[PDB]
Amino acid sequence: KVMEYENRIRAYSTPDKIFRYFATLKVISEPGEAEVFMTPEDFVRSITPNEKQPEHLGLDQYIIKRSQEREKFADEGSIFYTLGECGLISFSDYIFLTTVLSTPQRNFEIAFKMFDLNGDGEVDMEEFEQVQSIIRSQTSALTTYFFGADLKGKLTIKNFLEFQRKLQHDVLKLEFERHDPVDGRITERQFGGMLLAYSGVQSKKLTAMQRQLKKHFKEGKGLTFQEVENFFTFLKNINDVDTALSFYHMAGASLDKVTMQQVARTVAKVELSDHVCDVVFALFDCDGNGELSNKEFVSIMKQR
Amino acid sequence: LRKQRFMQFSSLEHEGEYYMTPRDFLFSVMFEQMERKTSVKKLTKKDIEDTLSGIQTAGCGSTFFRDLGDKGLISYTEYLFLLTILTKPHSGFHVAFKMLDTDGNEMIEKREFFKLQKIISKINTTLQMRFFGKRGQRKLHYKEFRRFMENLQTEIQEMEFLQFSKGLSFMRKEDFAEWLLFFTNTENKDIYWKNVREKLSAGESISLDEFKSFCHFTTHLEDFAIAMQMFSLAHRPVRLAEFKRAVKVATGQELSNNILDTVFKIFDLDGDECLSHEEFLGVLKNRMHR
Ligand SMILES: [Ca+2]
Ligand SMILES: [Ca+2]
Numbered sequence: 362k363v364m365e366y367e368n369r370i371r372a373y374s375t376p377d378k379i380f381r382y383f384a385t386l387k388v389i390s391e392p393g394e395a396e397v398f399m400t401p402e403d404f405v406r407s408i409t410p411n412e413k414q415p416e417h418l419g420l421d422q423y424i425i426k427r428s429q430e431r432e433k434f435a436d437e438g439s440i441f442y443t444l445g446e447c448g449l450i451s452f453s454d455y456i457f458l459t460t461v462l463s464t465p466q467r468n469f470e471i472a473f474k475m476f477d478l479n480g481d482g483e484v485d486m487e488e489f490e491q492v493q494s495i496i497r498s499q500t501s502a503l504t505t506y507f508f509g510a511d512l513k514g515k516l517t518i519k520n521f522l523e524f525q526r527k528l529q530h531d532v533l534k535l536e537f538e539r540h541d542p543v544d545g546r547i548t549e550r551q552f553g554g555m556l557l558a559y560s561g562v563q564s565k566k567l568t569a570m571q572r573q574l575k576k577h578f579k580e581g582k583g584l585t586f587q588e589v590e591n592f593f594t595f596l597k598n599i600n601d602v603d604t605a606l607s608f609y610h611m612a613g614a615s616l617d618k619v620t621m622q623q624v625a626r627t628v629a630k631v632e633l634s635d636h637v638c639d640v641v642f643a644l645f646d647c648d649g650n651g652e653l654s655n656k657e658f659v660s661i662m663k664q665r
Numbered sequence: 666l667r668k669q670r671f672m673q674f675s676s677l678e679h680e681g682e683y684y685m686t687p688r689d690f691l692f693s694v695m696f697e698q699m700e701r702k703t704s705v706k707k708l709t710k711k712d713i714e715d716t717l718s719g720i721q722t723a724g725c726g727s728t729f730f731r732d733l734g735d736k737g738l739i740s741y742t743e744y745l746f747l748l749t750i751l752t753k754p755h756s757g758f759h760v761a762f763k764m765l766d767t768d769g770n771e772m773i774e775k776r777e778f779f780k781l782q783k784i785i786s787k788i789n790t791t792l793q794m795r796f797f798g799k800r801g802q803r804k805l806h807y808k809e810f811r812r813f814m815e816n817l818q819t820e821i822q823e824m825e826f827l828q829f830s831k832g833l834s835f836m837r838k839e840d841f842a843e844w845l846l847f848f849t850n851t852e853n854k855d856i857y858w859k860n861v862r863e864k865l866s867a868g869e870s871i872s873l874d875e876f877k878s879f880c881h882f883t884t885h886l887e888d889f890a891i892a893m894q895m896f897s898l899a900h901r902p903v904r905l906a907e908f909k910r911a912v913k914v915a916t917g918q919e920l921s922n923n924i925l926d927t928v929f930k931i932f933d934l935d936g937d938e939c940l941s942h943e944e945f946l947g948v949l950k951n952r953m954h955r
Contacts, residue, residue, distance in 0.1 A: 471891050474914045476899075491899070498898045604887075605760050607749040611667060614784050627763045 368410045372563060376459070380452050383407035383414060387423035388449075397423060398449040400434045401441045404458065405535045410558050412539070440531040443524070445502040454503065457493065461525050462532060464496050465600060469525070472496055473518045482518035489516055533593055537586050546583030549640045550574040555589070556644055559596065561665045570644050577643050584637060591631040592641065598629040599662045606659075615652040616659065618642060667748070671741050673699070679708040685739040687730040687791065690747065694821055694955060695828060697848070713738065713789065720794050727819040729795075737791035742782045750814050751821060752953055754884040758814045762807050773810065775801030822880045826873050835870035838927045841879075845931075848951040853944060857931055864930040868923060875921040883949055888915035893942045902939040905929065 370382050383406050384399040399407070406412045418424065426432075435441040435448025444454050472492040473482040484492060486508045507516045540551040553571040560567075595602065605628045609616070618638045625633045642651070645658045653659070674693040675683035685693065689703070708716070716738055723732035739747070753761065765773050765780070775797040789799065795813075796805045829844040830836040836844075842861040849857065882889070892911035896903050903911075905925060912920055932948075934941040 467888070468891060471888060471914055472895060475892055475895055475910060480910060480913060495895050495898050499894065600887075604757070605764060607752070608746060608764075608781065609784065611745045611749060612784050613666075614787070623764060623767060627760060 364411050364413060367412075367414060371407065371410060372561070376456055377452075378420075379407050380455050382420050384450075385415065385418045385424050386426055386449065388426045390427070396451065398451055399455060401439065401448055401450070401535060402434075402539070404450050404455065405532060405539060407455075408459070408462075408532075408558070409536060409539070411554065440524075440528045443503055443506050456497070457503070458528065460493065460497055460500070461528055463500065464525075466522060466525065466597070467600070468496060468499065469521065470518055473521070477515075483515045485515045486512055529593075529597070530590070533590060534586065537589055542586075543583070545585055547589070548575070548581065548583050549578040549643075552584045552589060552637075552640055553644050556592075556641065559593070559665070560661050562661060566647060567644070570647065574640065574643060578640070582636065584640070588634050588637045591625075591633055592637050594631050595625045595629040595633060596662055599659065602628050603659050603663060610655070615650075615654045617652045621653075667745065668741060671744050674703065676703045676705060676735070677708055677738060678705050679710075679713065683741070684708075684790075685744060686735045687733040687737045687739065688735050690739050690744060691730050691821075691824060693744075694748075694751065695825055708738075717789055717791065717794055717799075720791060727816040727823060729813075729816060730820055731824065733791065738789075739792065740782070740790055742785045743790060743792050745785070746781055747817065748955075750817055752884060753814070755815070755881075758811050759807065761814070762810050772804040772806055774804050778805075818880070818884075819877070822877050823873065826876050835872060836876055837870050838865045838868060838923060841871050841876065841924065841927055842931060845948060845952065848955060849948050851947065851951075856934060857944075857948070860931045860933075865927060868926065871921070871923050871927075875924055878918065878920060879924050881918075882912060882916055882920060883952060885915040886946070886949055886953065890946055893946060897942075902937075903942045904939055908940055908942075 367382070370379055374382075380399065381397065383403045384397045385403050386398045386400065387395050388398060389395040406414065431447050433447050439448055441448040441450065444450060450458065469492070470482065472495060473484055474480050476488050476491045476495070477484045478488075486504060489507065504512060507521070508514045536555060537547060540547040550571065553574045557567055557571055602624050605624050606616070606620075609620070618635070621638055621641075622633050625631055641658075642653060645653055645661070647657055648654075670693065671685070672683045674689045675685050676689050677684040677686065683705075692699075706712075716736060719736055720733070723729050723736075750758075750761065762773065765777050767777055767780070773796070775793060778793065778796065793801075797803050825844060826836060829840045829847075831840070839861050842857075842865060846854070846857055846861075889911055892914055893903065896907055896911070901907060908925070908928075909919070912918075928945065929938070929940060932941045932945040933939065934944065
């Protein structure tokens with residue numbers, strides 16, 4: 362019951378409330394007023410349905426924390442250390458990171474080139490805030506990281522997209538690890554939950570499909586991180602995939618497994634294993650006809 | 666269903682299947698209707714060989730379909746394939762090639778091209794001859810695939826250019842407006858046409874090259890619409906400088922002043938020199954879907 366309420370917060374509350382529900386730390390350094398922070402685990406939890414918040418760390422309840430080294434909260438090399446020395450995520454960074462996670466690469470490319478000085482895809486700090494603001498409506502350590510110690514430098518699209526890919530990778534890796542993989546593999550059902558969560562769909566029927574996934578793969582070899590990451594790289598490319606499928610749309614044809622692999626390798630530049638595609642079809646082929654209509658998969662992912 | 670429209674323009678029939686000649690195909694792309702009903706000639710397997718032998722003499726460039734005229738055959742599958750190509754930016758050609766080259770040997774073979782027909786189903790034709798020879802002897806490499814698709818787009822633009830210029834060397838601004846609005850039958854069309862008649866100066870007429878540049882820009886509408894939406898979200902009116910930078914970002918290139926001026930005279934609907942860009946985009950989408 363708790364998990365369902367939490368899922369409504371994720372799907373319908375404001376970012377303010379989501380952050381106050383899932384963030385677990387309130388750090389004080391008096392006279393400095395306290396500030397609430399997510400750990401990377403909290404951030405991943407806030408975007409992962411059916412993951413319970415620690416029972417005494419619900420709404421507005423936090424774990425209290427007061428030259429000297431400060432406690433750190435992210436693994437070696439994590440993207441979250443771009444935000445500061447501890448890997449903690451303030452509210453404003455939470456807004457920014459969720460925008461970066463979900464924005465198509467092309468929209469950032471266009472935005473950088475439309476709002477900068479010369480159209481090269483190189484913004485300064487005020488232009489980058491225009492881009493963020495616009496990208497948001499469409500749907501300090503880091504400002505120094507992007508624009509230099511003096512805040513006078515500019516941010517190229519090439520560097521910012523490396524940031525975006527690193528961020529997407531580290532978050533997907535952390536989500537993968539939070540399903541506690543056995544020998545580097547998570548279960549078909551766990552992968553299925555990641556696909557539903559990503560789609561943002563609120564459907565009892567799709568939820569029924571996902572829990573059924575255990576029965577379908579009695580076999581149970583699970584999915585490696587490379588299999589999962591390749592499919593999410595395919596999803597990130599869904600608009601260009603859909604365009605590449607133009608002939609199939611004209612024919613009224615649905616998407617079968619061999620076509621999904623061909624367009625994935627052609628457009629997203631990844632190989633999708635037979636097993637990952639079987640899991641995807643078993644999840645979203647609701648009418649059970651063995652192929653995916655535009656309504657059953659592509660449209661869901663595009664309109665997410 | 667584009668199948669009704671295919672059979673309406675098809676002038677050929679064989680064993681229950683309808684076929685276009687290259688002439689038929691060109692007309693179905695430029696026009697919504699016939700203007701005259703087309704007579705359907707039944708083909709034996711002997712009419713077909715006769716109609717296919719001779720692809721020797723047509724031009725391997727941008728006059729391939731116009732040179733063939735009625736001397737060829739195009740199946741429903743191939744009609745849909747050619748239509749998808751006409752909408753693609755140049756960057757989509759290699760994607761289309763690689764989608765068909767399923768064994769990855771960088772050549773399309775007749776057997777791989779036949780996958781399109783199998784999609785439609787779930788005999789010899791002009792394209793199969795041009796690409797693979799009569800027994801599928803030949804294999805199609807990317808550079809002759811790319812050149813054929815570039816030349817297909819070029820051929821439609823050259824044919825439409827002369828169709829709407831009525832044979833003159835240059836397109837008048839209102840001839841370009843007639844082309845642009847040819848597939849537009851929406852509730853605001855009287856306002857567009859009033860602007861054409863009253864605000865289109867007899868200024869600098871449009872060259873074929875300037876027309877071709879606009880047609881290439883219409884294949885980058887996805888990025889152009891994203892740029893238009895970002896200006897709208899920024900509450901920035903789309904004046905000529907905004908339009909120019911969205912064109913350059915979507916495109917890499919410029920449009921000529923006579924064409925920019927024509928677009929703004931037609932779609933500046935408020936009189937403040939801002940473009941009604943949603944209505945413009947609508948007409949552009951009318952064009953692309955033909
Ligand atoms: Ca289905
Ligand atoms: Ca091949």
